[PDB]
Amino acid sequence: GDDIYKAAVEQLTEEQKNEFKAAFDIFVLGAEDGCISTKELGKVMRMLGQNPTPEELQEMIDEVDEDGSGTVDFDEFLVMMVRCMKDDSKGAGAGVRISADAMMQALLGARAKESLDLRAHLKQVKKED
Ligand SMILES: Cc1cc2c(cc1F)OC[C@@H](NS(=O)(=O)c1cc(C(=O)N3CC(C)(C#N)C3)c(C)[nH]1)C2
Ligand SMILES: [Ca+2]
């Protein structure tokens, strides 16, 4: 069940979508539909500093895929990206776990700081002390 996560993307801020967007550019490198599949994911995952398997890879894509087409778009990446950094995507299953912050370091790099969570800065018509 993904009701809270799927909604998380909505809570995100304009800066968030962009911060993560730049990552998809590299994450979907070569992809025909700019989506992340077993091929693309396998490339990045390996570059992150690990050595996953082709069978497990597909499990991740579908594990995050909302429709289950076989790949992940820019939106399907945010839904998981939220829980990825929160480390609450699985809870307590297996040691296997991808780092959201560490991932960006591969795609874009160190171009993701507090600014990423601009949502906290100010995205409404109000102010407090
Ligand atoms: C398309 C997409 C999906 C996911 C991505 C990043 C993406 F690009 O990252 C998070 C992933 N969910 S997960 O539960 O962390 C997770 C990690 C793994 C895995 O194969 N391994 C971790 C490993 C490298 C080790 N040790 C082996 C599995 C099976 N689930 C789902
Ligand atoms: Ca899909």
From Swiss-Prot:
Documented effect of changing A8V: In CMH13; increases calcium sensitivity of the myofilaments
Entry GO terms, CC: cardiac Troponin complex; cytosol; sarcomere; troponin complex
Single annotated GO MF: calcium ion binding
GO biological process: cardiac muscle contraction; diaphragm contraction; muscle filament sliding; regulation of ATP-dependent activity; regulation of muscle contraction; regulation of muscle filament sliding speed; response to metal ion; skeletal muscle contraction
Consequence the record notes for mutating C84Y: In CMH13; increases calcium sensitivity of the myofilaments
Ligand binding (Ca(2+) 1): D65, D67, S69, T71, E76
Entry keyword set: Acetylation, Calcium, Cardiomyopathy, Disease variant, Metal-binding, Muscle protein, Phosphoprotein, Repeat
Phosphoprotein as UniProt keyword: yes
Chain ranges of the EF-hand domain: 16-51, 52-87
Keyword Repeat listed: yes
Domain of life of the organism encoding this protein: Eukaryota
Recorded disease: Cardiomyopathy, dilated, 1Z: A disorder characterized by ventricular dilation and impaired systolic function, resulting in congestive heart failure and arrhythmia. Patients are at risk of premature death.
Family: Belongs to the troponin C family.
Purpose: Troponin is the central regulatory protein of striated muscle contraction. Tn consists of three components: Tn-I which is the inhibitor of actomyosin ATPase, Tn-T which contains the binding site for tropomyosin and Tn-C. The binding of calcium to Tn-C abolishes the inhibitory action of Tn on actin filaments.
Misc. comment: Cardiac muscle Tn-C can bind 3 calcium ions per molecule. Domain I does not bind calcium.
Protein name: Troponin C, slow skeletal and cardiac muscles
Species assigned in the record: Homo sapiens
Taxonomic lineage of the native organism: Eukaryota, Metazoa, Chordata, Craniata, Vertebrata
Full-length numbering of the shown residues: 2 to 91 of 161
